[PDB]
Design an enzyme around this catalytic site. Sequence first.
Site, PDB file in Angstrom:
ATOM      1  N   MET H  41       0.840  -1.189   0.000  1.00  0.00           N
ATOM      2  CA  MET H  41       0.000   0.000   0.000  1.00  0.00           C
ATOM      3  C   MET H  41       0.878   1.243   0.000  1.00  0.00           C
ATOM      4  SD  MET H  41      -3.047  -0.958   2.673  1.00  0.00           S
ATOM      5  CE  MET H  41      -4.081  -2.401   2.471  1.00  0.00           C
ATOM      6  N   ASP H  42       0.608   2.159  -0.926  1.00  0.00           N
ATOM      7  CA  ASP H  42       1.313   3.433  -0.953  1.00  0.00           C
ATOM      8  C   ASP H  42       0.684   4.373   0.076  1.00  0.00           C
ATOM      9  OD1 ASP H  42      -1.059   3.911  -2.255  1.00  0.00           O
ATOM     10  OD2 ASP H  42      -0.156   4.488  -4.163  1.00  0.00           O
ATOM     11  N   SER H  43       1.018   5.661  -0.005  1.00  0.00           N
ATOM     12  CA  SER H  43       0.525   6.619   0.981  1.00  0.00           C
ATOM     13  C   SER H  43      -0.998   6.662   0.999  1.00  0.00           C
ATOM     14  CB  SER H  43       1.093   8.007   0.691  1.00  0.00           C
ATOM     15  OG  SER H  43       2.498   8.043   0.862  1.00  0.00           O
TER      16      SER H  43
END
Lengths: 105, 161, 183, 78, 506, 192, 49, 95, 80, 141
Positions: H41-43
């Site tokens: 998961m990115d930001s």
Amino acid sequence: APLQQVGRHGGPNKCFGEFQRVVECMTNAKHDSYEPCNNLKNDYLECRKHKVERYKAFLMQKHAEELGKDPEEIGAPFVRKRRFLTSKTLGLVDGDDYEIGVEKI
Amino acid sequence: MNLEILDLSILGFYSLISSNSFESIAILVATIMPVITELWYNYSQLFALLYTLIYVGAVVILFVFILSVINEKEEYEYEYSGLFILILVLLLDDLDDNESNDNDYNNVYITDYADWFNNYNESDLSVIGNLLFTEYALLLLIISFILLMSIIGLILIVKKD
Amino acid sequence: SSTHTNDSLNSSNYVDKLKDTHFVFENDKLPSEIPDVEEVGATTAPLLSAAYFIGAKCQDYNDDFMLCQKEAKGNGPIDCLKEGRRVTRCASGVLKDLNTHCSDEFRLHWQCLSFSNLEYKNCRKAESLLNKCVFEKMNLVKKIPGIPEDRQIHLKQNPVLKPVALHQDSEVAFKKAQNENSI
Amino acid sequence: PYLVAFRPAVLVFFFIRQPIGAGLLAGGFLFWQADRHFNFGIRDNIHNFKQTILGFPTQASKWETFKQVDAQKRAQLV
Amino acid sequence: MLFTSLLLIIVYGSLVNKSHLLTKLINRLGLIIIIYTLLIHLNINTLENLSIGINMFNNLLLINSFNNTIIELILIICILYVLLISFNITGLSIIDNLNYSKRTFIVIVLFNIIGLTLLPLVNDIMILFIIIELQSYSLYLLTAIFNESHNSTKSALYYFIVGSIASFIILDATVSIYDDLGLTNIQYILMYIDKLEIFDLLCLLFGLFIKIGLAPFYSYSITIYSLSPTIITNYISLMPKLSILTLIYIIMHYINIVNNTDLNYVISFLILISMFIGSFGGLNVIRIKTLLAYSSLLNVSYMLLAILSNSNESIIAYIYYIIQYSLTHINIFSIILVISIYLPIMNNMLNVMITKYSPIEYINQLKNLFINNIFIAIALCISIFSLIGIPPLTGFYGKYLVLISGLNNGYVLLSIVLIIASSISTVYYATILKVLSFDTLSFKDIISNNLIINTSPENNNNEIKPEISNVISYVISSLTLIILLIIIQYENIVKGAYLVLLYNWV
Amino acid sequence: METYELIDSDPKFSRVVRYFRPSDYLTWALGTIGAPGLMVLFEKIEPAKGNTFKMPPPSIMRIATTIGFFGGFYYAYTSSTKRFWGYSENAKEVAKDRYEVKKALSEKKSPYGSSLLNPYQQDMSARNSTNSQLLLAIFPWFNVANHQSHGIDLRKYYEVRDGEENWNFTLPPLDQVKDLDVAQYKEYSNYP
Amino acid sequence: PYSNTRRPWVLRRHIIMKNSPTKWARKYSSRRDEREQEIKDDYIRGMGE
Amino acid sequence: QSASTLTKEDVLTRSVSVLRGFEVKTKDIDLQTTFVQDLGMDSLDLNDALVALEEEFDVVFDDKTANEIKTVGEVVDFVLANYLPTEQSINHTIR
Amino acid sequence: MDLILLMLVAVGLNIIDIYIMIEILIMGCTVNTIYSASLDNDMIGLIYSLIQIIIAGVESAIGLSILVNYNRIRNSEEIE
Amino acid sequence: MLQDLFNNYVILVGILGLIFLGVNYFIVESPRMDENNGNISDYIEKSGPFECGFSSFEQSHNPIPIAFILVALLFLPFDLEVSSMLPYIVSIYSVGIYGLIIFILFLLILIVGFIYEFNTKSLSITTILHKKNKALVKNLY
Ligand SMILES: CCCCCCCCCCCCCCCCCC(=O)OC[C@H](COP(=O)(O)OCCN)OC(=O)CCCCCCCCCCCCCCCCC
């Protein structure tokens, strides 16, 4: 002795006399037991509810049914609407079946 | 046709299906009105008017409290009931309306005989006041004492200060 | 007093419907062993107009009938039938004498009472004429017991409370006697 | 006396909002009024059933007592 | 005196400024008012004159030697209770300031004392309903005197609802009797004692049973006594019982005239259930006030057996039992209020939260009382042994006199059940004593500077500073020695109870 | 029981206060100063604030004196009432009562006095006030009416006792005394 | 005028107002009516004497 | 009434299902499962998951905790320690 | 229908709905008192009815204040 | 006394109220005779609440604080006191001086409640904000 059974005009009502004779009997010093005042108690209770008298009317109505007597031939005439307490029903000499005035006395 | 029977039939239906608190404060008013009218037309017109004078003031104070405490809870909630179970319940209830089992007392009609001895003829409220202010004056003065306690009681409960 | 009872006509027919009231008659006469007596046939306004003359004429019989009731000790309506018949005849005698001696003066007074809510204070003028006529012909004086003779309200010269509406017949009949009797 | 004034207002508004609930309530109301008016005796017989099962003195029970006394008294004379 | 002085106190309290000292001094004025009320009442009411029974106020009230004794008992116990709010219970402001923060506290008590004393005297159904409302309303206002407390207000809501239902039951019973007879005065109704429905009076008793917390209506009183502040719970758990039970005795005295055994069986059913619930209910509880609530339910069942039997031996049993149980109730709550000073302070598992209203809330907060204060711990042991019924304490003679009246009337089952109930309830009475003392030796040499009492300062380090205030200590000493040494004067005290008559005469 | 002579089963308020003994006034004073004195004693027993004695404020002593003043009168009122009832020794009060009644009877005046109340209200007032002193500790109620229900028979005032010959009161029959029941219903049996 | 003496309809039909310990006893318990039926029966039994 | 009825197994089980409805690299989620590495998961995806896990448990992550959260187990720890049932009306409890 | 406690379904699910039930239940007692007093022509029953109405109104106010303060306790933060 | 004429009037009042609703219902032109924007049920833009043009939070079921709740509660004890004087109004002559003194005693006990409410200031408005003037002071050195 506080007042009980006070009529709507401040005096004794219909059943006060029965109640008064019960109190006088129960509080009399000549009585060994409360047995003498038992009939006075039933009379006071009969003055209020008339339960025995209603029971007698139950027997008379029922006994008349079993002998085939007509309710309208042995009872008392009655009118259910106040407007039709007419002069003919009342028996006046010049009576009429027109309605009577009950709107404003 | 005694139309008061129909009025109580509708009121009993609405008491079973009532959901929110506003409907309950309406069941109260829908109850006092049949009482007031039936007292007016059968037994006591004095107490029909006393009921209206006192209960209405209590009803509005009751209503204003609903405004301050209404809390969103029963508007969106769901009830199930069922129309068939409601009407069947009311039918079984309507079957038995004999509060007393003395058949002669309930069936045989009676009368009273008038007399002319009461020439000083005044209203029931004058006799009630005559006794209440003379013989049962202690009852009146205790009632005054209880009303005073409520005044102090309401303040010591509600007032933050 | 408009309290609903079980002894007379109530306020409206909704009261009868709730009570399932039956207005019951009895076709039987009084038993033949009891002597008959003709009832008083006057209505409310004539009776109130004649109230103080029945009192001044039947005082002995009225008291004797009431004293019979006290001595009856509950058995009242049975033991005072004979005394009651005397009261009825004496009261009818007064009404009979009114219609033969003071007919116009009597009918004037109770026609004012019907016109004026049956309040004695509204019909002083017709009452004064009737009192004068009765006293001359029957020797009956209206007296209100318990108070001095000069403090009787019906003889007050300047009453505080007076009728709003004037009975025209009483005004005319009062003027006629003023100009013809008190010259 | 206020129910006489309000009753037309409440009844029509009751039928408008809930015509089926009103018709069922009003229909049952009329049916019992027909039982009383036309002497069908349905409500009376239910009342006579409740008293019999709950041990109350019924109308027949009180009449049986009278008939028992009546036969007892007649033999006391004969 | 009560009514006249209440009006002056009501006005005076609203005139002067609000301060803790002024409220405390106003409470002491309430103490003087009750003392003068007792002196005036003693000066005019005597047992010998009131034996016949004297009507007052158009026969609305009827005072006899049985009613008079309870009135004096109510005044005496109310004197002891006011000492709690009129003097220091602990001496530490964080705890004692609660009793001085409500100026209407003393006013409500004087309102309730009037209702408590008049209720046994009622001689009319109209005044019976009025007075039972006057007593109930004051109890609700006292239960809610601390209106900034969530639990205190919640209890008052529960109290109001349940007590209004009982009042309606009481009113419904009187309306039924008036409908039957058309009479309102009790002595007039006694003339028709054989013809009215006697179970119309059982409905009247049922409403009274709710107000004393009898089973099956015991649930609300157990809940209310535990949630209310300890000072409030002390009053409301005892005072209503002194008057209502006395009234129940008078009503049962009239009921026994017709000797309806069906009515006797229903009441015996309620007594039997209340013994079972009162004894088994307290076995698994951790709160002291919940435990005492079941103790109250159990001791009421014992008294109701004497009330149910309703004979000459029952007058002596009820009169003696109610006096000695009130003193034991007062003594226990006095100690519980005092011993909050020995509570340890933190500096945690189960996240136990203790409030200022009820610092002593759990039975195990009484731990090591035998070490902290041996004289007070013994005083609490004597009171608990009295509730158990250990002779020759006052509680033994209470059970002995109750059994005599019960067995004399043929209540074999209830006499056996209560003695089994006494044994079962001994289990949770002993648990208090186990907590007080049983760990004395394994804890005697420990350093406990973390108590609440240690937060108090010291004056000069050369003076002797008593750890408990003068008045509260003397009351605990007096009541404990009365409970312990009643054998000395038991014969004279029971001869006095012989003279208290309720239309015995001859 | 050490009962005594019954003087008045419902003494009037003025009679009770007039018949106060010097000790009854003494107890009235003791009640008045007993309430401020108890406030000093309670402070002496245990100070309200802290550990040192502090005189209660003057406003507390003012309201305390008022409470004691009413309490002192109620005690004295009940002390004097017992003498009328016969519960307490009342030899002095009987002699004073007999002189006052015989004096009023000789003047053909009611020993009880004329009343504004009609026959019902005199009877009703006596019903409300008789024996009300038994609850004077709870709430007050006094006999401030001239009724005739005092529980005594006025014929006992027509016998001369020891120490009453020098009074020389000539007592008329009871049907000539004004405002008495036995001399009131002359013309009608339901009107006085 | 002859009229019935029955309780108001609202008393004997309201869903809530008709419930009380004495109203249930009057409606469902035969203890009261058994006693009062004895009084009525004595009236006919005692006629002969 | 006003107390939590949460167990570590239920909170983990509900957390896994809510995380399964996202586009994660693996469906095998346990306490040690990291958001950046294991799930990927990115930001923005992480904060979509946090709010999704907020709605499921009716809790609100504080800003300090949310920015510093690494593993699935940390979320389960947070829910257990901070969850409280919502206050009800004056009628829900006493009636 | 009464013995199965059908009245427990007719009472609403708020604390105020319990208050209304109590008022209705007490009002049933007063209607029964008025009915008996009028039939007997007894003013003592009507005095009783008047007392019941006044007293029933007193407890309605006392109970309302308890419920009013109960709601205030919940809304206690009052940061405004 | 006859109230049959009063019964007819009450009947007329009940019917007359329904006439205003019915007559307005039968007189208004049908929506198709007007701009024909459909039945009122669909026109939600018309049946919505009035907020002077701008919509706001729908706070219909939220509780509303009431600043005069104490005064409203104290209305009931005083209302009963006023209703308690009705027996005295129509019996003032019969009770005489005895009833008059009792009437004063009834009012004197209730006047203590009036003194109590004045001294406690219980009949004020319960504001939640309070404006207090802070003093500016300088801790000089
Ligand atoms: C002038 C006439 C005034 C009344 C006309 C309107 C008739 C409607 C019913 C009036 C009273 C009949 C009995 C109702 C008792 C209260 C029960 C209730 O909740 O009100 C019924 C009303 C209908 O709502 P409905 O949609 O049908 O049901 C909810 C569905 N979830 O739900 C509502 O909340 C609407 C209520 C509006 C406000 C009514 C206030 C009560 C007024 C009563 C005055 C008359 C006294 C009762 C007389 C009839 C007795 C049955």
